[PDB]
Amino acid sequence: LENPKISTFQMNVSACAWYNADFDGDQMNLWVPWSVMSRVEAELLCSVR
């Protein structure tokens, strides 16, 4: 999100069923895999599909 005034993690409402989340003030963690091996298994194993 290249708007500098947005500080929130935004996601589709139909994805909240995975995390049992809603938008009343919930917080969520996010980390981006930097290693190649961790990056491969993120995409092949741990994708939300």
Partner: protein, 339 residues
């Protein structure tokens, strides 16, 4: 000595795809780059004979490096120094009040640290090459080091000897085992036979326990011993001939075996008797033919190596005169013909 040793290691491969294009060559290269010239598992590695047995190039599992590892079982030519061995050349580099530090020249890189006694600091100086006697298990091979540390003493030939009582016969297969030592002695002899007669003769005269009035100490082709007034009524026996005869089982190896200092240490001669008539100051040791033969063969090999190394080191008489002070320090410890 110098022999074969089988080692096991695990090599890390930083680029498995390249390494696996030629596993044998890369494996030999890495073993040589890691182990040649270093101490590892109570031994000093000289050469890599080969790779007996290896594993696949496994990919390391506990980190995301993508790197490989391979288990290798390899055979290497190594050199293990025994207790109380005898080196012929060491260059003393450090002469302090506390210890003396020298390095071997002829043999493989070895550091010899003689603890400084009051009778040693006033003789040995920087630049001298002397022979040294080792000690028991003082040759600790600290892993990863380029030399074998060992404490030693400036060599003066002894006046005593050992007597072994053998009550069990030397069998044929153990003779096959000692065939390797016999062959080693044969190679040492044929290597010594090339050298100048004067150098070997002078070194033998210096390191013979007694003194003899010239031209009476050496018969290279027959080894008849020193012709001094027939001191013993029994001729000393050649060890090689006795072993070759016991190969065909014509002689018995029982009784008392001794090598008195009058005998030439480098020759294959020795004394055997049916009764304990040797004038030893120590009790004879009851042992089998295997132990006694191994000890005698090892002593012969050690003294042949000592004479060969002495003759190789001092190729010119000028260096002999430069080291003549050590020669006279040896000489004053000799025993005269007052008997």
């Amino acid at each position: 000595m110098i022999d074969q040793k089988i080692f096991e290691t695990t090599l890390n491969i930083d680029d498995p795809t390249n390494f696996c294009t030629n596993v044998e060559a890369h494996l030999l290269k890495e073993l040589e780059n890691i182990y040649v010239g270093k101490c590892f598992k109570n031994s000093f590695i000289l050469n890599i004979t080969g790779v007996i047995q290896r594993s696949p190039c496994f990919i390391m599992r506990t980190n995301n490096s993508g790197r490989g590892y391979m288990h290798v079982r390899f055979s290497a030519v190594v050199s293990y120094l025994n207790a109380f061995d005898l080196i012929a050349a060491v260059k003393i580099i450090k002469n302090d009040s506390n210890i003396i530090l020298g390095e071997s020249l002829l043999t493989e890189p070895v550091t010899i640290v003689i603890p400084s006694s009051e009778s040693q600091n006033n003789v040995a100086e920087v630049g001298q090459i002397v022979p040294v006697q080792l000690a028991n298990s003082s040759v600790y091979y600290i892993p990863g080091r380029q030399q074998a540390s060992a404490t030693g003493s400036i060599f003066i030939p002894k006046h005593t000897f050992s007597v072994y009582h053998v009550q069990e016969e030397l069998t044929q297969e153990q003779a096959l085992n000692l065939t390797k030592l016999v062959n080693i002695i044969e190679m040492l002899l044929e290597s010594r036979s090339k050298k100048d007669f004067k150098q070997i003769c002078f070194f033998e005269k210096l390191y013979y326990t007694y003194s003899i009035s010239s031209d009476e100490i050496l018969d290279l082709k027959i080894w008849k011993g020193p012709k001094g007034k027939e001191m013993s009524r029994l001729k000393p026996c050649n060890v090689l001939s006795f072993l070759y005869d016991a190969l065909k089982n014509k002689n018995s190896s029982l009784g008392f075996w001794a090598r008195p200092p009058n005998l030439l240490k480098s020759s294959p001669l020795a004394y055997q008797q049916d009764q304990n008539s040797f004038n030893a100051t120590e009790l004879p040791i009851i042992c089998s033919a295997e132990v006694m033969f191994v000890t005698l063969l090892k002593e012969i090999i050690n003294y042949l190596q000592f004479i060969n190394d002495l003759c190789d080191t001092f190729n010119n008489e000028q260096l002999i005169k430069r080291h003549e002070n050590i020669w006279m320090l040896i000489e004053q410890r000799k025993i005269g013909h007052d008997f």
